Amino acid sequence: SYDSSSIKVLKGLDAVRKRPGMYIGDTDDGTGLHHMVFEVVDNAIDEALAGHCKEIIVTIHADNSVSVQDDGRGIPTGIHPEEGVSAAEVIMTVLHGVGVSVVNALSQKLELVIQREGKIHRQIYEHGVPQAPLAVTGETEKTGTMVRFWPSLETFTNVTEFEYEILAKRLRELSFLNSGVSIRLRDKRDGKEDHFHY
Numbered sequence: 001s002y003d004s005s006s007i008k009v010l011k012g013l014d015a016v017r018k019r020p021g022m023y024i025g026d027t028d029d030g031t032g033l034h035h036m037v038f039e040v041v042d043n044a045i046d047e048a049l050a051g052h053c054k055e056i057i058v059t060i061h062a063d064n065s066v067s068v069q070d071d072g073r074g075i076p077t078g079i080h081p082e083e084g085v086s087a088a089e090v091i092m093t094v095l096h097g098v099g100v101s102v103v104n105a106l107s108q109k110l111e112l113v114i115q116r117e118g119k120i121h122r123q124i125y126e127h128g129v130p131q132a133p134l135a136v137t138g139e140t141e142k143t144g145t146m147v148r149f150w151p152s153l154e155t156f157t158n159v160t161e162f163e164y165e166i167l168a169k170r171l172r173e174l175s176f177l178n179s180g181v182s183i184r185l186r187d188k189r190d191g192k193e194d195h196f197h198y
């Protein structure tokens with residue numbers, strides 16, 4: 001049921017928005033804010049442990065959004081018959097690693113770009129709610145997934161700006177734990193880059 005899926009998803013988004021610390025960690029001391037990045041990266045790490053993702057690129061944008069790009073297969077784009085929406089929309093919205101739906105719920109905005117089967121697919125979310133169905137925007141010979149999110153400053157207080165060093169420490173750690181995955185970190189605010197690989 002297209003319909004029952006939509007009702008269940010919106011109850012899930014409401015649950016996360018009302019009790020955000022329960023899902024992401026402390027919303028004031030910066031740990032929940034940085035965990036937003038690490039949850040997205042952990043999904044790319046899963047796609048590396050599956051053996052398709054070899055490189056993960058984490059970018060801090062000058063507007064204080066963060067993007068995570070992988071070179072994996074790309075989140076599946078076909079209509080999942082039960083929910084009647086793209087398998088990507090299901091992954092991005094269904095509550096379950098805390099699940100990328102938690103990051104989506106707690107993002108003012110989220111941009112999804114999927115490259116696979118020779119096409120580029122894009123979708124925009126606001127507070128976990130898709131603006132429109134996943135749509136093809138052009139062709140590509142590449143594969144992978146890009147998630148860019150703008151954290152809600154309704155949810156997150158006090159520590160609101162991403163700290164390069166906090167991201168660098170956990171990404172260095174994840175590269176140590178995941179031998180042969182390359183994890184790049186880029187700060188568009190000041191030109192800092194790192195390249196973690198073990």
Ligand SMILES: Cc1[nH]c(C(=O)Nc2nc3ccc(NC(=O)CCN)cc3s2)c(Cl)c1Cl
Nearest residue numbers: 040043044047072073074075076100145147
């Ligand atoms: C940054 C990022 N990356 C991902 C990400 O790649 N997740 C993915 N989940 C799946 C699940 C299934 C498949 N199966 C096929 O392709 C079947 C083809 N016969 C591919 C992927 S790829 C997520 Cl989720 C996030 Cl967030």
